[PDB]
């Protein structure tokens, strides 16, 4: 199915306290493959996955050169935003940037992203057409007028539609045994007791990849977010993911309830009900 | 591979 490559950059100002923290991570799908951390001693782009270690010195030297360039840019950007918002100099602020591309089943371009946040809020985003910008506020309109006048978008369009797909393709064949797998969710159900009148039913999916999953609870009534509490998908740490979902039920008819699991690993969506 | 050109806000 669809695939994606994403770079995530964070830069954090540490005021009357010195130079900014800069962290960059690259992903192919739900798998990290590179990092750079201004605070590490190495000052190098570093491998984080087995199938990228096979790249040669020139790949590492370029990636290192280019990520240090990004880091100075994000450094100037902290000072510039401080100014757009007349914030004083004693606060710690955050700039985050994301970019990359999705390919479809056939590995041809589907979608591109390039967006920024400041202090946790949307600041500027390239739009799905890759031709114009969405500024969230009038500070972000300054940025926008500056990047239109210097035609940033066209240049980003060539990279997103172009180079970015070529890299994802390259990687999708280097990391074939890792990246082009799917693990189907392993499932099972727990049953407790809320004191003594009603019990919770919890539905578990374990060691699946990639991360997208759907769990819904149904009743021979129908659907109910009657606290179907749903936890964020979480990493097991080995490459796979976990998720759970619980509905609360009257403690004498648990068989009315079914857990449906959908994952691109499952030939057909699983249905689970409580074996008493 | 990351962008080879950078530009400020």
């Amino acid at each position, epitope marked *: 199915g669809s695939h994606s490559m994403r770079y995530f950059f964070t830069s954090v100002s540490r005021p009357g306290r010195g130079e900014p923290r800069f962290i960059a991570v690259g992903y192919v799908d739900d798998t990290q493959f590179v990092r750079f951390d201004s605070d590490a001693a190495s000052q190098r782009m570093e491998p984080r996955a087995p199938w990228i270690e096979q790249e040669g010195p020139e790949y590492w030297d370029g990636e290192t050169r280019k990520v240090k360039a990004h880091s100075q840019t994000h450094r100037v950007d902290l000072g510039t935003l401080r100014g757009y918002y007349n914030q004083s100099e004693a606060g710690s602020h955050t700039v985050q940037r994301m970019y990359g591309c999705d390919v479809g089943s056939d590995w041809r371009f589907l979608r591109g992203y390039h967006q920024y946040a400041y202090d946790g809020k949307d600041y500027i985003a390239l739009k799905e057409d890759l031709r114009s910008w969405t500024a969230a506020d009038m500070a972000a309109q300054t940025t926008k007028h500056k990047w239109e006048a210097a035609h940033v978008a*066209e240049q980003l369009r060539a990279y997103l539609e172009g180079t970015c797909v070529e890299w994802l393709r390259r990687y999708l064949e280097n990391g074939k045994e890792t990246l082009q797998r799917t693990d189907a969710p392993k499932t099972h159900m727990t049953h407790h007791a809320v004191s003594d009148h009603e019990a919770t039913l919890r539905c578990w999916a374990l060691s699946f990849y990639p991360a997208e999953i759907t769990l819904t609870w149904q009743r021979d009534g129908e659907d109910q977010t009657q606290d179907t509490e749903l936890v964020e998908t979480r990493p097991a740490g080995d490459g796979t993911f976990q998720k759970w979902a619980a509905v609360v039920v009257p403690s004498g008819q648990e068989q009315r309830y079914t857990c449906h699991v959908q994952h691109e690993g499952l030939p057909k969506p699983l249905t689970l009900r409580w074996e008493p | 591979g990351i962008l080879g050109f950078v*530009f400020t806000l």
Partner: T-cell receptor
Amino acid sequence: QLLEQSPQFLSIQEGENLTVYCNSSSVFSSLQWYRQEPGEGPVLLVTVVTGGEVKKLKRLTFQFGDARKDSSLHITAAQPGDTGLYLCAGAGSQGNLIFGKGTKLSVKP
Amino acid sequence: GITQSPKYLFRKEGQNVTLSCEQNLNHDAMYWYRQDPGQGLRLIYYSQIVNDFQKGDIAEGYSVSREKKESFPLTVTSAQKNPTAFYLCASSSRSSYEQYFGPGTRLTVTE
């Protein structure tokens, strides 16, 4: 990334029309023309960005090909003062400009 | 808004020299080139942003620094046996976009 200009040297008579080309294999997201006189810095003429677009400056017409892999520089009724070295450059994917080697134009009276 | 100085310079071979280039155009990116006899431009060094620089096509025997947005000095050391040339500096609002060229400096190194 490469920009080939042609021809290297071009010599015409005052009053004649001319065209000079700048070619590549790869799409360029922006393109620039300059004219340089000896002992001086190149002067920026124009920037083109949209495929198909046409801009005019004095006696000069610049065109960006529809697929954005080519540009041309056309002069109507050339005059001695049009003499000089013409250069195209294009946006470089590593934060520079890609330069072709020039067309040297002489316009004889 | 771009200035290079001086227009003409002369040095004995092996005598290290620094060429200056300042701009008050507010441009993030700066470039150095050399040009020879009826020829074209060759990129020496450039800098997309302050505190960062990277090599061009003919970097060896040259060095640069970029500590202030407005300035981009080029040092000509006992390089390649290369140094007599017309040197041109340029800048651009962001890197890869249109460049504006200073008037250039003519450097001769004699024996």
